[PDB]
Amino acid sequence: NLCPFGEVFNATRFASVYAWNRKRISNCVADYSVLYNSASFSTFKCYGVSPTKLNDLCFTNVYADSFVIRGDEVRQIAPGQTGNIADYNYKLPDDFTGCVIAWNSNNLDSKVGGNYNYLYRLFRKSNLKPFERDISTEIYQAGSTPCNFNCYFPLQSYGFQPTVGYQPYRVVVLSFELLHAPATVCGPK
Amino acid sequence: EVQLVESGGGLVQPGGSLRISCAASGLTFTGYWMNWVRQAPGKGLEWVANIKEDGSEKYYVDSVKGRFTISRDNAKNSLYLQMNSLRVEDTAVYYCARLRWLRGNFDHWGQGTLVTVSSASTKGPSVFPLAPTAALGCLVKDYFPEPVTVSWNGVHTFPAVLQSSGLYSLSSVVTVPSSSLGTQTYICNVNHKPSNTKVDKKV
Amino acid sequence: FMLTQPHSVSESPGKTVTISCTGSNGYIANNYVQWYQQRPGSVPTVVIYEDNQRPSGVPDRFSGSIDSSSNSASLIISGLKTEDEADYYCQSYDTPNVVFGGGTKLTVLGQPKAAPSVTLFPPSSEELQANKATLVCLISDFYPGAVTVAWKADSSPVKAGVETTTPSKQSNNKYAASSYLSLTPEQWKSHRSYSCQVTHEGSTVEKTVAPT
């Protein structure tokens, strides 16, 4: 059997970076070399593991998390980064084991008026713990006076237009999970 | 061990075409991305093009676009680069290299071929004996373009100088004990592949 | 997207050097960064791949680091040796093109006092019959690589027909260069002798040859 990675990368609508979707990958085999070899991706970096050895390895599960961000925001999907997406949207652990893959989505996700359906969180009382997801839509109180002065809605929009640093970039995070349980996703052996 | 052997460098006129190949031995050349990356004299590395393992997609740098076509034969374990509409700026030693994975290192490289692009006169060297611990060697005069190989089957061959006429000249010296001059015979082998010149001279 | 490197960097033997590869118009840590050494007149070989992984058989002194904050990938050589003196290149890959740095010329200080080795050859017998004469002054094994070559005929300066090579780095880290003087056979045989004079770190080294 093959890991249905196609379901992830070639899906029609990706999540918004605040409600980032997660798919679990199990009981399958993946040609990881199909992924990295493609010039399609404007980013391919893995942390905690060399991609070539991915094919030699077994993992208890693999998690595919996908969302859309701005190109010049990509630098953040990486351990130890800071920023809106790093702090208020998607947080990778300091010690990561996975791969971060990104491509420009302007042809699909930019509209002429701006595509306002891709959203992000701009304010939060505190930062995300790694792999935490916050869809809370309650008013953010930025002022001493209770909103019940400096009161804001946490979620902004990207409003994507064919302007690349502000262009839509779809992102996939593959985290490689090892448990004391039988590995069910392995490379080609 | 694995050697990557290229051929086909030489002199071409502006607007002319040249074709160069890299042939593999000791590695499976099939499953990898193949690339051409050039380096002009006294200059730095510049990636020129690359090609997918199965030939599906080919990518080139902007300044060669439309002018170069990169191709491969997996059966011969060979990589190819057709250079058309050549310009002076293209003058460079052209290396072939294989990247281990698409964003990784170049684990294997070729020895390099030089393409020179300019006016005419693939003019050959005139090889003269430079006669005598003592030193003896050969003078490689008035040639064009590079490269020249000098052999003797402590040898120090020197880089050439490009004269005011526009042609290179090269010298080469080896040192040997004074006692062995009478007994041993010393001959230098000069090859200027552009001029189909191969000369052996006694000293 | 582009990469900038320091033009030159120097540090003493036994110390540690960092050679930076900082990104313009993009993010360097978006994709892996690879490092390539090129010794004079030799093919590039890998020294660091995948930002910080080290190939087998490459000296243990080579390390790598990445700094997304300063937009730079770094090449580190612990406990330097004189044999590390070579040009170093970083590369990375944007979605459609492989991209290389300008290149870094690494120097290992404190290894000088190498005077120039001169061997001087008179015009060949074959060359004279061809109505030409070229005197060949070959200079090798000197450090630092800065020299001025002047020719004399009868201890009177020569102002014509002199072509001198830019000093070039050898394998043994010294420098080699060649100077050729073009003469008509009459100018050669008429004069007493010709001399080749090399001044290096304030010392003049000269050889004199004579028509026999």
Author numbering:
A (entry chain E): 334 to 481, 486 to 500, 503 to 528
B (entry chain H): 1 to 132, 141 to 161, 168 to 217
C (entry chain L): 2 to 213
Show the paper's wording.
The omicron variants of SARS-CoV-2 have substantial ability to escape infection- and vaccine-elicited antibody immunity. Among the total of 476 monoclonal antibodies (mAbs) isolated from peripheral memory B cells, we identified seven mAbs with broad neutralizing activity to all variants tested, including various omicron subvariants. Biochemical and structural analysis indicated the majority of these mAbs bound to the receptor-binding domain, mimicked the receptor ACE2 and were able to accommodate or inadvertently improve recognition of omicron substitutions.
One antibody, P5S-3B11, failed to compete with any of the five representative mAbs used, indicating its epitope was beyond the regions these antibodies recognized. P2S-2E9 and P5S-3B11 targeted the outer face and inner face of RBD, respectively, distinct from the ACE2 binding site. P5S-3B11 buried a surface area of ~810 Å2 and consisted of 14 residues on the cryptic inner face of beta RBD. Most of the omicron variants had two substitutions (S371L/F and S375F) in the P5S-3B11 epitope and were expected to affect 11 of the total 13 hydrogen bonds and salt bridges formed with RBD. As these mutations were located within the epitope, their impact on P5S-3B11 was more likely mediated through a direct rather than indirect fashion, similar to that found for P2S-2E9. Many antibodies with similar epitopes to P5S-3B11, such as S2X259 and DH1047, were also compromised by substitutions found in omicron subvariants, largely due to the main-chain conformational change of the residing loop (Y369-C379) by triple S371L/S373P/S375F substitutions.
